[PDB]
Ligand binder design. Structure first.
Ligand code: HEM
Ligand SMILES: N=NC(=O)c1ccncc1
Length: 291
């Protein structure tokens, strides 16, 4: 399948900065959600899950089609809880009905990362809604109960290498696991709505114990009240992953730069950009705009 980016008619940087701003202002306003974590983490996860269905072999799934809007995909057991991100974006889509669903889901993630003090993530427009029959089947998102070999192999389908995998997983600085959603419970760290390299520092510095949670699933727990999924913990069990974890734990700027590249790549997988497509946009934060 070939998916060619097509700019929403007549729209330019200024139009998308307005959409960014509306998302960012609502992120500020709706501050009570999930015990005052806010919608930042769930928006990042939404961007990731809507992109992470991609299969490099046949170009099925991916961010282009905005297919999460269809029942098969929004009811994916892997997507439990993402309805909160979708509901958040509903009034944004109402105000800006011209933006494609794929553009909105991916921009939601970019906006959340930046507003939570993360790196700038260049973002390109032009994803185009595709019909219901293009919705990828359930089961393309990764299991949490597996090891490093599983993680490495899984991410090859998304054309991600070891460095890209470890960088992307640092998004687990954000939010938490929710028992009723995924069968895991707890945050990965303390500053749940600030984008930092805390995931790597916690992996290396906390004293982890392999325990069973109330859903009868194993997770690694620390006395600080943090947790790690088996797949997170695998990043320090595998010697190749471990080196990269140590790298990011010791260099905030390097982690920011690598995450930005990997996250843009994730959000752009499957999309053909014409030679005369606009350059990627780098949106100003509300803080940068004095808003
Ligand atoms: C091996 C790969 C991964 C696995 C197995 C995994 C698994 C999970 C699970 C089980 C949850 C908890 C869901 C819940 O109960 O609310 C979660 C949350 C989350 N994931 Fe991951 N994930 C992976 C990779 C990623 C990537 C690549 C990103 C983005 C770059 C990401 C971003 C997030 C965020 C921000 C949350 C918190 C959501 C919230 O607080 O509502 N994850 N993940
Ligand atoms: N990315 N994978 C997930 O979010 C997930 C993993 C395991 N169980 C539910 C959801």
């Amino acid at each position: 399948l070939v998916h060619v980016a097509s700019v929403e008619k007549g729209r330019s940087y200024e139009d998308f900065q307005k959409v960014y701003n509306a998302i960012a202002l609502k992120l500020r306003e709706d501050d009570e959600y999930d015990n005052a974590i806010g919608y930042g983490p769930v928006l990042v996860r939404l961007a990731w899950h809507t992109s992470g269905t991609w299969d490099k072999h046949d170009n099925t799934g991916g961010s282009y089609g905005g297919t999460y809007r269809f029942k098969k995909e929004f009811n994916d057991p892997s997507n439990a809880g993402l309805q909160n991100g979708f509901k958040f974006l509903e009034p944004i889509h109402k105000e800006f009905p011209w933006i494609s669903s794929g553009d909105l889901f991916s921009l939601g993630g970019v906006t959340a990362v930046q507003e939570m003090q993360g790196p700038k993530i260049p973002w390109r427009c032009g994803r185009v809604d595709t019909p219901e029959d293009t919705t990828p089947d359930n089961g393309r998102l990764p299991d949490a109960d597996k090891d490093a070999d599983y993680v490495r192999t899984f991410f090859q389908r998304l054309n991600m290498n070891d460095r890209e995998v470890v960088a992307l997983m640092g998004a687990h600085a954000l939010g938490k696991t929710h028992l009723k959603r995924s069968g895991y419970e707890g945050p990965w760290g303390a500053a749940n709505n600030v984008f930092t390299n805390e995931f790597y520092l916690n992996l290396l510095n906390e004293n982890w114990k392999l325990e069973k949670n109330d859903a009868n699933n194993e997770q690694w727990d620390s006395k600080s009240g943090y947790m790690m999924l088996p797949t997170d913990y695998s990043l320090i069990q595998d010697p190749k992953y471990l080196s990269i974890v140590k790298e990011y734990a010791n260099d905030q700027d390097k982690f920011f730069k690598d995450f930005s590249k990997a996250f843009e790549k994730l959000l752009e997988n499957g999309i053909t950009f014409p030679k005369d497509a606009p350059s990627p946009f780098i949106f100003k934060t509300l803080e940068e705009q004095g808003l």
